[PDB]
Structures are given as C-alpha cells and as structure tokens.
Amino acid sequence: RKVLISDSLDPCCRKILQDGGLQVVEKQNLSKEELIAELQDCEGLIVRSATKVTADVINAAEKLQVVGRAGTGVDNVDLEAATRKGILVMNTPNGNSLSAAELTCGMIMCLARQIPQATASMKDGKWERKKFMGTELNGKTLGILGLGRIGREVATRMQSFGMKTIGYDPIISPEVSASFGVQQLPLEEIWPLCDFITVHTPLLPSTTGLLNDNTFAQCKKGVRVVNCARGGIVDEGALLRALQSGQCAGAALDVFTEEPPRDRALVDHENVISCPHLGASTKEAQSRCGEEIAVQF
Amino acid sequence: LRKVLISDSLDPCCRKILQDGGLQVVEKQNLSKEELIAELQDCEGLIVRSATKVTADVINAAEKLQVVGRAGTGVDNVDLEAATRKGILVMNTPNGNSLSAAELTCGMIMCLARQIPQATASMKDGKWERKKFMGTELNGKTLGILGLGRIGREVATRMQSFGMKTIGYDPIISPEVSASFGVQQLPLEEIWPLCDFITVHTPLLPSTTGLLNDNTFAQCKKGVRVVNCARGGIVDEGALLRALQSGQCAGAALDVFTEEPPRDRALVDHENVISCPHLGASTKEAQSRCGEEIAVQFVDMV
Numbered sequence: 001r002k003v004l005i006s007d008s009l010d011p012c013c014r015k016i017l018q019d020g021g022l023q024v025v026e027k028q029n030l031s032k033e034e035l036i037a038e039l040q041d042c043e044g045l046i047v048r049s050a051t052k053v054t055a056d057v058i059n060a061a062e063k064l065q066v067v068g069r070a071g072t073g074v075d076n077v078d079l080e081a082a083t084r085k086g087i088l089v090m091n092t093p094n095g096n097s098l099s100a101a102e103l104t105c106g107m108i109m110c111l112a113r114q115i116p117q118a119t120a121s122m123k124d125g126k127w128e129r130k131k132f133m134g135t136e137l138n139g140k141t142l143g144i145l146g147l148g149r150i151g152r153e154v155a156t157r158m159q160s161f162g163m164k165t166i167g168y169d170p171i172i173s174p175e176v177s178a179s180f181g182v183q184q185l186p187l188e189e190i191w192p193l194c195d196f197i198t199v200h201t202p203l204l205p206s207t208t209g210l211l212n213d214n215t216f217a218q219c220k221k222g223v224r225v226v227n228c229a230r231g232g233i234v235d236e237g238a239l240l241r242a243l244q245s246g247q248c249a250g251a252a253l254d255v256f257t258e259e260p261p262r263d264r265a266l267v268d269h270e271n272v273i274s275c276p277h278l279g280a281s282t283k284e285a286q287s288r289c290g291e292e293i294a295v296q297f
Numbered sequence: 298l299r300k301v302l303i304s305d306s307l308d309p310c311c312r313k314i315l316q317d318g319g320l321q322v323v324e325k326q327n328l329s330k331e332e333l334i335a336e337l338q339d340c341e342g343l344i345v346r347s348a349t350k351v352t353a354d355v356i357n358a359a360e361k362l363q364v365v366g367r368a369g370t371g372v373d374n375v376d377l378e379a380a381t382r383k384g385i386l387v388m389n390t391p392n393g394n395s396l397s398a399a400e401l402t403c404g405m406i407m408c409l410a411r412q413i414p415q416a417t418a419s420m421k422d423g424k425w426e427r428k429k430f431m432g433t434e435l436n437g438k439t440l441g442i443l444g445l446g447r448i449g450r451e452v453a454t455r456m457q458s459f460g461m462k463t464i465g466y467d468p469i470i471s472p473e474v475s476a477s478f479g480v481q482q483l484p485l486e487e488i489w490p491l492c493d494f495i496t497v498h499t500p501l502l503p504s505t506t507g508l509l510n511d512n513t514f515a516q517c518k519k520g521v522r523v524v525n526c527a528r529g530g531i532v533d534e535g536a537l538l539r540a541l542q543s544g545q546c547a548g549a550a551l552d553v554f555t556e557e558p559p560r561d562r563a564l565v566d567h568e569n570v571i572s573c574p575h576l577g578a579s580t581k582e583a584q585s586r587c588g589e590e591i592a593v594q595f596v597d598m599v
C-alpha cells in the first residue's frame with residue numbers, strides 16, 4: 001500500500017509505483033530516527049547505497065514486507081535481520097549490466113595501451129613515448145569467466161576488436177554461449193590460452209579467489225586481468241605477487257575485497273588501473289535500476 | 298643500393314628482411330646531427346621512425362643517399378622538398394598502424410565516457426571519490442566520425458558493437474559506400490548538432506586545419522566529447538580550450554598536438570582533458586608491420 005523512497009531516485013521510480021496504485025513518500029538522507037518514523041506505516045522501502053537498513057531499522061518497522069535496492073550491491077541491507085523477520089530483499093543487477101560491461105571493455109582497452117598512466121605522465125609535463133609502447137587487441141584471446149548477461153555483453157563488444165572470446169560458466173550451456181560466439185572449455189584449459197582475463201560471476205565460496213597463486217601460475221606470462229564484478233573473485237595477495245614477478249603484466253580493478261581498500265599496494269602499482277566502484281555509476285544505469293525496482297514492487 | 302642505416306629503434310624484422318635481400322645493415326639510435334651525417338657517408342639508404350630528423354642539411358651532406366624510408370605513416374620528419382631536389386626517393390608505410398590508431402581512438406572514447414584516467418589518478422592520490430564521478434553509458438549515443446578512410450571505418454565498426462549510432466562525413470567516400478560499413482552520412486552542417494561524441498580521422502590539409510573551431514563548436518550539442526588521434530591542428534587548440542572552459546565541450550582526448558611535445562600546457566592540464574604522448578602507432582604489432590612494410594619496399598627496389 002505505501003512505499004518510502006529514502007535515497008535519491010529518478011522520478012520514474014515514484015510514477016511507476018503511483019501508476020500501480022501505491023502511495024509514495026520521497027525523502028533523502030533521513031537520520032536513523034526519521035527513517036524509523038517514516039517507515040511506521042510503510043510496507044515497502046526503496047534504497048540505493050546511502051540508506052543503512054540495519055537490524056534496528058527492520059525491527060522497528062513492523063509493517064515492512066520488502067526492501068528494494070535500485071542497483072546491485074546490498075551491503076547497506078542487513079540480510080540476516082530481514083530474513084530473521086521474514087522480509088524479502090530485492091535488487092536490480094539487470095539495470096547495471098550495460099554500464100558494467102562498458103566499463104569492463106574500457107578497462108581492457110586501458111590495459112592494452114596504458115591510457116590512464118599516459119595521461120598522468122602528460123599531466124606531470126612528461127613526454128614518454130618509449131615507456132607506454134602497448135599492444136594491439138586484434139587477434140588476442142580474451143577469457144571470460146562468467147557468461148551471464150555482463151559476460152555476454154563484454155564478449156560481443158570485444159569480438160568487434162577481433163579478439164578470440166573463450167570462457168567458462170558452470171550454469172550456462174555451451175549451446176547458449178556458442179550463440180554469442182563464446183567457446184566454452186574446461187576451466188583448466190582456459191588459463192594458458194589467455195592474453196586477457198575478465199571475471200563476471202557472483203561472489204560465492206566457489207568464485208572466491210578464482211584467480212589465485214595456483215591459477216596465476218597456469219596463465220601465460222604477461223596475462224592482463226580485469227575485475228569489474230565483485231572484490232575477492234581475484235585473490236588480491238596473489239595478484240600483487242603476479243604483478244611483482246611480471247606473471248601478470250597489468251590489472252584493472254573497479255572492485256576490492258575492502259572498499260575503500262586499506263592496503264594500497266595494488267592501487268599504487270604502476271601496472272594497475274583502478275576506479276572507486278564506478279561500474280553502475282552512469283545516469284542511464286541509475287534510471288534503469290529505479291524503473292526495474294518499481295516494476296518489481 | 299648496398300648499405301642501409303637504420304637510425305631509430307625499429308622492430309628487429311626490418312634489419313632481417315634487408316639482410317635477407319642481400320643488403321648490409323647498420324643499426325643505430327639517438328645519433329646527433331653530426332653522428333648521423335658521419336654514419337651516412339657510405340650508405341645509399343636510410344630508414345627512420347620519427348626521432349631522426351631527415352633535414353635539408355642531413356640530405357645535402359649525404360652524397361651517396363638514394364632512398365629514405367619511414368617505418369610509419371606520413372613523413373613529418375623528412376624534408377620532401379630537399380629529397381626531390383637531390384633525386385632521393387621517399388618511402389613510407391601508409392596503412393601499417395591503422396588498427397592500432399583505431400583501437401586507441403576507441404579506448405579514448407571509453408576513457409572520456411567513464412573518466413577512467415581521472416578515476417585512476419583519484420585512487421592513486423589515496424581517495425575514494427565515488428560520489429564525485431558520473432559516467433555516460435555509450436549505448437544509444439551518437440558518434441560523429443569526420444573522415445571515413447581506413448581508420449574512421451575501423452572505429453565505426455567497433456563502436457557500433459556498443460550500440461552507438463555512427464554518423465559522419467567524408468567528401469571522398471560516398472554515402473552509399475559508408476552505409477556498407479554502417480556510417481550514415483549527412484551534410485557536414487547536420488552532423489554537429491546530433492553528436493554526443495566526435496572523432497576526427499582526416500588527413501591534415503588546409504581544408505581540415507581547425508575543422509573544429511569556435512564556429513563549429515557552437516554548432517555542437519552542449520557537453521560534446523571530442524577525440525583527436527589523427528593529426529595535431531584538426532581541432533583548433535585555442536577553440537577547444539575555450540569550449541572546455543565554457544562547458545560547451547565536456548571533455549577531450551588528445552594523442553596529437555600542433556607542437557610535440559606541447560610547450561603550451563593549457564589543454565593537457567585541463568581537468569576534462571585526457572592525453573597520450575602520440576601513442577597511436579605505439580604497439581608491438583604496428584611497429585612490426587611498419588618495419589616489415591618498409592624493408593620489403595627497399596628489397597623490392599634492389
């Protein structure tokens with residue numbers, strides 16, 4: 001019957017909810033007390049990352065039935081406390097697919113040509129031709145680990161660069177991935193073939209440290225790695241060791257095991273390109289997530 | 298043609314092809330004007346990349362010189378007037394770097410759309426400025442491609458995979474031909490108002506010097522993003538700075554400048570400008586291809 005939008009949402013969110021017969025209250029940056037007070041007669045709550053849906057908030061909101069996040073990450077929602085009260089938690093990973101795939105492709109191009117490091121060099125007044133000699137993507141092999149929507153979108157874009165796209169996903173059939181030009185091979189056969197590796201999986205026990213000391217050792221010397229999915233899929237200590245030896249020639253990281261990362265060794269490495277988790281940070285993705293969460297309600 | 302001096306750092310295939318063709322080869326780097334002239338006294342050929350300046354003084358002091366080859370596109374570092382006066386043939390590799398230049402152009406478009414260089418600098422400064430960044434999704438946006446030769450065509454087909462609408466103009470390439478590689482041509486005046494991003498891929502001619510100027514920037518959509526990986530001066534540098542200062546241009550990516558290295562720092566230093574030190578052809582692959590293409594030409598002459 002009534003939904004509280006507690007973060008900054010595109011007006012489309014409220015209008016879809018209102019067209020569906022729901023009463024909508026839109027407020028921003030409420031204190032814990034104001035949040036609890038607004039939620040008393042709300043069965044629904046829509047957030048982005050700013051609102052903290054803690055155990056204290058859920059337990060004080062007796063009429064609450066669903067917490068909806070317009071985006072991917074639900075670190076601001078207490079999943080345990082929501083499940084403790086029988087509350088369902090919804091999100092919109094689909095709304096962020098295109099923007100995350102586009103950033104991943106940008107990162108691949110940045111690893112081949114070191115555009116971020118070359119800009120920093122130019123801004124320091126330097127003209128370093130030899131230092132930034134790079135590589136051509138045409139004809140190189142891209143290994144895509146995770147063949148859901150984001151992996152598929154990365155594949156079709158990088159195929160236009162003449163990259164050979166191979167990969168693996170234990171959920172996606174070889175017939176489905178063949179339909180978008182991705183040949184699946186057993187995971188052990190992927191490592192030695194790749195010039196570039198990108199990860200597009202959820203973070204689970206089976207995907208934690210997918211890239212680790214053992215799998216980096218199976219890679220071609222000078223592999224370049226991208227993680228625009230979730231911090232922890234690439235083991236950060238193993239990645240630093242691989243960068244230190246040259247086993248990994250460069251890495252691009254939008255995500256970290258700890259955000260912001262307190263260990264700065266990866267961010268500070270000359271062959272590491274990084275962003276502060278910008279995969280979903282476009283007006284288009286934010287508007288799409290807002291629409292998708294209101295449709296779900 | 299019996300002896301060839303390679304005076305810049307080239308791919309090792311260049312020396313090997315010349316030698317397999319029966320030519321003696323001397324490989325040197327970073328020679329002074331005096332050292333270069335001294336090395337050339339018994340050479341009928343010279344192969345350069347870009348650092349060696351084949352000036353009138355060098356040409357006139359190299360009596361035995363018959364041919365000057367550049368392992369790259371254009372001949373900026375060769376005095377064509379002085380070579381023609383001395384009956385010296387000038388050879389180069391016009392298509393040796395096409396894919397590498399198109400790939401850099403696409404990387405610059407992505408970097409402008411998501412402020413990747415600025416984000417990396419922020420992280421390296423120990424900051425987490427997520428709330429200060431707002432990127433643009435490319436799908437559905439319009440990319441204007443001015444110049445539809447090999448490089449513009451290669452940029453087009455790559456950016457089409459991102460769902461960008463690729464429009465453009467070229468007075469040589471017909472609208473029917475560009476349609477075959479997915480670029481919709483319209484009169485040049487109709488291109489400016491439609492673009493979210495503009496990239497230039499023309500030669501540098503009197504007609505393309507300042508193609509983007511105060512007049513044409515005013516015809517663009519407010520917040521246009523511009524890329525120049527082609528030739529310094531196609532985008533008027535003063536007009537670009539004025540457009541960045543007003544917000545008429547939201548960002549620019551430059552691989553090339555009217556002066557290299559640029560001594561005027563206004564553009565490079567701008568917060569919304571990303572840049573490279575002329576890296577368009579700087580890949581192992583493009584260098585290998587240019588080195589091969591120039592050496593095969595010298596052996597063909599023999």
Ligand SMILES: C[C@@H](NC(=O)c1cc(-c2ccccc2)nn1C)c1ccc(C(=O)O)cc1
Nearest residue numbers: 093145146147148168169170171200201202
């Ligand atoms: C399609 C599905 N794939 C998976 O879940 C998956 C892949 C892998 C995997 C392990 C090792 C190597 C390679 C791959 N292990 N798992 C469970 C999926 C992908 C992305 C999302 C998302 O972006 O939210 C959601 C679902």
Ligand SMILES: C[C@@H](NC(=O)c1cc(-c2ccccc2)nn1C)c1ccc(C(=O)O)cc1
Nearest residue numbers: 443444445446448466467468469498499500
């Ligand atoms: C195909 C041919 N186009 C041209 O020469 C050209 C384009 C344009 C032009 C003027 C205004 C707006 C838009 C375009 N004016 N001219 C003569 C070509 C392109 C690139 C190269 C190269 O990369 O060196 C070589 C040749």
